[PDB]
Structure formats: C-alpha cells, structure tokens
Amino acid sequence: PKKRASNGRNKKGRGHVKPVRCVNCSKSIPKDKAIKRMAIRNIVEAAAVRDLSEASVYPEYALPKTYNKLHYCVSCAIHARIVRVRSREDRKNRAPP
C-alpha cells in the first residue's frame, strides 16, 4: 500500500523532471526524488592547515574551500549511512537535525 503521500519525492504538479545521475553508481533518478546534499569543506584539513600557514607566504591568506553538490540515490545513500530508515511517525517528519 501507499507508504508516502509524496510517494517518494517532491512532485505535485509537473509530470516530468529531467533526471540526474547518482554519483556513486552512475544511476539515473529524478531531481525531485534524488537525495540532494551539499558538501562544503576546507580544502586541506584542520590538522595540516597549520603546516600550510607556517610554510605559506602571503600570510593570513584565506584557507579557501571546495563546494560540491551531491546527488545520491536511495540505495547508495542507505549504504553510505545517510537517511537510513525511520519509524512511521518520524518518517512523516521532514526537517533536518
């Protein structure tokens, strides 16, 4: 039976969404059902940033960052220890932590 009023996704009034590809298994999936996350990270790490700034000319430079938006599918996500599973009531819950 029906497990989700949204049925998996965020489609109410389109019909078609021109999908994208899950990056971990190259798998086609719509952009409204995809899991989207975003990974913004310092380029190096909080550990070696000290070595960088110590061996760096141009003091106090920036420590720039790398930004990438990540589309995983359901299977790859649940394998990668993300949205894993929830009971019925908290399955209805929609906000992040």
Partner: protein, 127 residues
C-alpha cells in the same frame, strides 16, 4: 626573492599525479606517482605513496633551484566523481613539511555545463 612554480596535483581514485611546472606550464619538472613509489596497483592512490611522490618532487625542485609553488589541485571531473581522492591533501602536507613555500591553492576540477552522459546505464553500476 622567490622562485615560484605550479604544483599540478591530480588526485583520483586509483592514482595521484603530482607534477610541477613553470608559471606557463610548458616547461615541466618532477612528475611522479604513487605507482612509481609502490607496487600494489591498489595503493596507487594512497596517502603514503602520494607523500613519497611529494618528497621526491621537493628534492627535484630544490636541486633545480625552485623555492615555492602555487597549487592547483584537481579531481577527475567531467562526468566522473568531481571529489578529490584521499592522496591530495597528504601530498600537499608532505611537500609543505618538506620545505617548499606555498601560494594560491585552487581547485581547478573540470566541471561541465550539463555534460554528455555518464557511464553505467540508468540502472547503475549494480553491486
């Protein structure tokens, strides 16, 4: 006072190319890889191997006379993962500990404007 090169790191799963050039990029120096530092075919991309590569290119840049480098880190890009492999940061830390001076780190990963098509089929790299 400073003699600057360009580091050209490419950190991919399965490998890590570390090679350095003059500012123009035509005259190049010290290209070395994790497979050139170890013999597994699995640890090609590993941080220890990348670190060894970095130590070697540092030795070569110091034997030439170069003292510093602007850094251009890169992943496979295009249609593939767009996220760097594990060895990039390790190589960077390795050479910065080795003794060179650093500048202008940038991620130059080739990114498309909705590229052609990705390999594996719509149902995936099933495993």
């Amino acid at each position: 006072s400073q003699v600057f090169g360009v580091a050209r790191i490419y950190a991919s799963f399965n490998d890590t190319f570390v090679h350095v050039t003059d500012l123009s990029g035509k005259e190049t120096i010290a290209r070395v890889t994790g497979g050139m530092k170890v013999k597994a075919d699995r640890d090609e991309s590993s941080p220890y191997a990348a670190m060894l590569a970095a130590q070697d290119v540092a030795a070569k840049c110091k034997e030439v006379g170069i003292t510093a480098v602007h850094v251009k880190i890169r992943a496979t890009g295009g249609t593939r993962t767009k996220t760097p492999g594990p060895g990039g940061q390790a190589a960077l830390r390795a050479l910065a500990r080795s003794g060179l001076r650093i500048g202008r780190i940038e991620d130059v990963t080739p990114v498309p404007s909705d590229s052609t098509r990705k390999k594996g089929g719509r149902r995936g790299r099933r495993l």
